[PDB]
Scaffold this active site. Structure first.
Site, PDB file in Angstrom:
ATOM      1  N   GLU A 154       0.824  -1.224   0.000  1.00 41.70           N
ATOM      2  CA  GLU A 154       0.000   0.000   0.000  1.00 41.70           C
ATOM      3  C   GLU A 154       0.849   1.260   0.000  1.00 41.70           C
ATOM      4  OE1 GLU A 154      -3.110   0.447  -0.478  1.00 41.70           O
ATOM      5  OE2 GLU A 154      -3.983  -1.560  -0.209  1.00 41.70           O
ATOM      6  N   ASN A 202      -7.470  10.225  -5.068  1.00 41.30           N
ATOM      7  CA  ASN A 202      -8.356   9.545  -6.009  1.00 41.30           C
ATOM      8  C   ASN A 202      -9.168  10.553  -6.810  1.00 41.30           C
ATOM      9  OD1 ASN A 202      -7.665   6.768  -5.299  1.00 41.30           O
ATOM     10  ND2 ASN A 202      -8.621   7.265  -3.330  1.00 41.30           N
ATOM     11  N   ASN A 225      -8.803   5.590   3.508  1.00 41.14           N
ATOM     12  CA  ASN A 225      -9.518   6.497   2.602  1.00 41.14           C
ATOM     13  C   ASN A 225     -10.406   7.497   3.330  1.00 41.14           C
ATOM     14  OD1 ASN A 225     -12.126   6.979   0.716  1.00 41.14           O
ATOM     15  ND2 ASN A 225     -10.282   6.840  -0.522  1.00 41.14           N
ATOM     16  N   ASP A 284      -6.295   8.638  -0.043  1.00 45.49           N
ATOM     17  CA  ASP A 284      -5.830   7.538   0.822  1.00 45.49           C
ATOM     18  C   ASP A 284      -4.594   8.049   1.593  1.00 45.49           C
ATOM     19  OD1 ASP A 284      -7.704   5.830  -0.465  1.00 45.49           O
ATOM     20  OD2 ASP A 284      -6.269   5.517  -2.102  1.00 45.49           O
TER      21      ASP A 284
END
Length: 129
Positions: free
Chosen positions: A35, A46, A59, A52
């Site tokens: 990640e 995003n 998120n 995130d």
């Protein structure tokens, strides 16, 4: 902060992630590796206006408040900035909520794609916890 693999494993063990809801420590280390590459300062903006945050890429539409995500919730009761800190305590607390509320680790795309079908104990090899 960029944790070493084993430094993160030890911190995650201390904070109670080993076997949390049935997920051994290596799952969480593996998830962090893919990640964020162990960078607490990692972010991913995003297209939908959410971001995130941190070592587990949590998120902002659901889990933390960044003050700039449309149509959002804050289930962990934190500002997303706390997820960018060197101290992973708040990230771990929120990750535990994610895994309770989702009945597993499938919220983490990178864990789904890179970790779940492997021997995740490899991520703890060599580590003094």
């Amino acid at each position: 902060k960029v944790y070493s693999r084993c430094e993160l494993a030890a911190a995650m063990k201390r904070l109670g992630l080993d076997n949390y809801r049935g997920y051994s420590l290596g799952n969480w280390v593996c998830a962090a590796n893919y990640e964020s590459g162990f960078n607490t300062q990692a972010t991913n903006r995003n297209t939908d206006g959410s971001t995130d945050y941190g070592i587990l890429q949590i998120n902002s539409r659901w889990w933390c408040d960044d003050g700039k995500t449309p149509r959002s919730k804050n289930a962990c009761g934190i500002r997303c900035s706390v997820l960018l800190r060197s101290d992973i305590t708040e990230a771990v607390r929120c990750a535990k909520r994610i895994v309770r509320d989702g009945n597993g680790m499938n919220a983490w795309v990178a864990w789904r794609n890179r970790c779940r079908g492997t021997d995740v104990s490899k991520w703890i090899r060599g580590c003094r916890l």
